[PDB]
Structure formats: C-alpha cells, structure tokens
Design a binder for this molecule. Structure first.
Ligand SMILES: [Cl-]
Ligand SMILES: [Cl-]
Ligand SMILES: [Cl-]
Ligand SMILES: [Cl-]
Ligand SMILES: [Zn+2]
Ligand SMILES: [Zn+2]
Ligand SMILES: [Zn+2]
Lengths: 166, 166, 166
C-alpha cells in the first residue's frame, strides 16, 4: 500500500492503526483507539483541524468513490473542521463536508453529508445525500432520500451544542 | 485456557485479540481491531470463508450454549460464508447460520439466526430465533419472538446489497 | 497527567488504555479492549467490584463535572457493583450509581443514572437524570427529562436478567 501523508502539524497518536493512502492535513488530531485503514477503499482525505476520536473506525469499500474538493476520487473524504466523535463509523464511499459534527456512535456509509451539518448520537446515515446545514436528531435512521429531504436546518442551539462538545 | 485452532489457510491479523478455544476454519479472514475471546463462554466456531471485520467483538457468557452443526455445544457458532461486519457484537449464546450478512454495528445475543439471513445496520437481535432467509431492516430492535416471526424474506436486492458490501 | 490510583485487589488487563487521574477501587475488573482516559475531563472514579467490559470507552469533556459520593467533582463517577458491558460509552459529565447494569452498546453522556437502574441494550441516555431503580428497555433514546420521568421501575425479572448476564 501507499504510505499515509501526514502534515507536519498533524497529531496522530501512536496507538492509531493508520494504514495506506490517507492524506491528513494541518492540525488534525487523531486519538488513540482509532482505526483508519485505506487497505480496501482508497484514498482517504482528512481535512485541516479535524478531530478523530477514540473508538472511531474509518474504512472503505474497494469499489465506490466520491469526488473530493480537489476533483480527485476518494473512498472517504472528511473536510476541514470536522468532529468525528467517539465510536463513529465513517465507511466509504463517504463525503463529509467542512464543519460537520458527527456525534457519538453515528454511522455515515455510502452517503454525502453537506458542510455544516450537526449529526447527533446513535444516528445511521446511509445511501443518501444530506444537504448542507441540516440537523439530525439522536437515534434517527436515515436510509432513504425522502427522509434526508425532510431534515430540519441547524439552529443556533445545535451549533452551540456541537461547539460545547468539541 | 485451551489454544485456538487456526486452519492453515485462515488469516488472523496480528492485532486481533484471539484467546481460548476458538476453532477457525478454512480461508477465514479476521481483521485487525477485532476481539475474539473464549475466556468465559467457550468454545467458539468460525466457519470457512467467514470474514470478521475491524471493530467486532465476539464474546460469550460462561453459562449458555448452542448446538453446532457437529452436535457439540458452543458459546458462539458462526457458520461458513458469513460476514460479521464492522462493530458487530456477537455474544454467546449465539448461532449464526451459513451465508448470513450481519451489518454494521449490529448485535446478536442469546439468539439463533438461520442460514442466509441479511441483517442490516444498527440492528439488535436478542432472545429470539430468526428463521433462515429473513431480512432485518436497519435500526430494528428485535427482542421478542413475535417480532422475529413477522420479518420479511430476503429478496434479490438484499442478496445483491450484501454481496456488494462484502 | 496525574497517575491512576489502582487498588491492590483491582484487575486491569495490560491491553486497557488507562490514562490520568482514574481512581479505581477494590476488586474492580477492567477487561482488555477498554479505553479509560482522564486526559480531558478528570478525575474519574470506578467503585468497588465494578466490571468494565471489552469494547467500552470511558472519556470526559474538559468542562462539566458531577458530584461524587465523597463530595468531590468528577468528570465520570461510576459506583460500586456496576456492570459497564461491551461497547458501552460512558462520557463525562456522568454519574452512574451503585448496582447499575449498563447493557451492551449503551451510552450515558451528560447524565445521572440513579443507583440500581437496569439499562438494557442499544440505549442512549443523554442530558437527563434517571431516578434510582428504573428500567430502560432496549433501543430507547432518552434525551429529555420528560422521557426519563416516564420510565418503569425495575422488576424482579430485570434484576434476574442483569445478574444472569454479569
Ligand atoms: Cl478522544
Ligand atoms: Cl458501537
Ligand atoms: Cl475490516
Ligand atoms: Cl469482557
Ligand atoms: Zn469495511
Ligand atoms: Zn461478555
Ligand atoms: Zn471525548
């Protein structure tokens, strides 16, 4: 496999299982207890200032890609200023836009989550595109575009909540 | 504890925490980031060509067994050609039949899942017997036999989905 | 960081990622595959005879504390005789009282769970106080005090179930 590209100012805990063509940008913080393996789906991108918390798995299917902001194909693209919180599963093909909060134990698989979404806890997002700036309440199972298209907009209190957590 | 029995053609990543009387058959693939410990409930069986993905825990209660295809008691029996996908929890006593797909973050505990089931994501299956060839949609919490007995049959698109993932 | 205080009779598996001011009392059993890091929120308390099972993460927010039984502030307080079962997430600020069962894949975050509760599988408890002696059925997402105030009392069969698991 290709080697990870780890920006000089990124922090990757030595316990993180980081493998393959994972392109990690400035000031990223990858916690212990994480698995970020581009051994099937590849490449991955993790944007600047993004935090990957303990218990997260990031993996990808061999087949299936999203377009990154650079126009290249990725198995997983996670933007800048994103929080991928404890036990989240981000499984390629997946795009998560800048500034998103992905709350505890939530999954994004075969999906695009627009910039500035606040996804709460114990959520499944699969097989859909979530527009930018949407809020997903805890426990929601979003598997159809019809559901995704009904989601509420992020409110000030949702932004406040996310900022408080991270 | 007894030692694992690892078939010559099985692959067990060195990071896997594999302990006790775990009987692993031909062409099994056990990923890093897995825990498969027969230190309480024992023994375990993992059938040929089965894949155990990163984030899975397989454990068992000291008391409580299922009958394997060989007539012996097991804490956990997982058949041939099974996919135990990321973050699944298979907790003995448990039987999972040949050809099952167990989707991301799903749990099987004190239960039997018949051959050829397609269990989707964020599912709980507990205290029930799922007949062969049933589909469990994402997010379902199955804790009574009445619920298990209402499940739909696997359709071609469910089989196609599972094959595409694995 | 301060060092953990590990009681002489506590068992902490060498694979456990245990960091910071974590105060572990008599006869505690911490499994492999656990993460218990007081590197942000701190301190933590884990009471006597409590079991932390494989797959659990215990972490805390930098800001936000609960009052322990000793009157001191904690990020996470887990009482005596508690079972924190596989893949549970206990995230500070959090208080879990003596004798609680926290079932598989359940989360307690920014919440107080009174002594003697039986919390089942795939539960979220967030932003609430659960009174002592309440039962939370599997799959419940408890995010408001109104929901918490409707919970049923633990019955003999719930106690029997918990004892049987642990
Ligand atoms: Cl973390
Ligand atoms: Cl999980
Ligand atoms: Cl894997
Ligand atoms: Cl354990
Ligand atoms: Zn995968
Ligand atoms: Zn167990
Ligand atoms: Zn945390």
């Amino acid at each position: 496999l290709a080697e990870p590209e780890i920006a000089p100012t990124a922090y990757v805990h030595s316990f993180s299982n980081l493998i393959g063509d994972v392109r990690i940008k400035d000031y990223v913080h990858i916690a212990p207890g994480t698995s970020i393996r581009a051994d099937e789906g590849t490449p991955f991108h993790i944007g600047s200032r993004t935090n990957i918390q303990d218990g997260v798995v990031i993996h990808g299917l061999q087949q299936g890609r999203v377009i990154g902001d650079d126009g290249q194909e990725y198995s997983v693209w996670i933007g800048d200023n994103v929080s991928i919180t404890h036990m989240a599963l981000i499984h390629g093909p997946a795009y998560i836009g800048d500034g998103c909060f992905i709350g505890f134990r939530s999954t994004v698989f075969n999906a695009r989550v627009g910039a500035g979404c606040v996804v709460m806890m114990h959520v499944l997002i699969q097989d859909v595109e979530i527009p930018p700036g949407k809020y997903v309440p805890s426990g929601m199972v979003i598997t159809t575009q019809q559901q995704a298209d009904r989601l509420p907009n992020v409110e000030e209190s949702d932004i406040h909540f996310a900022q408080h957590v991270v």
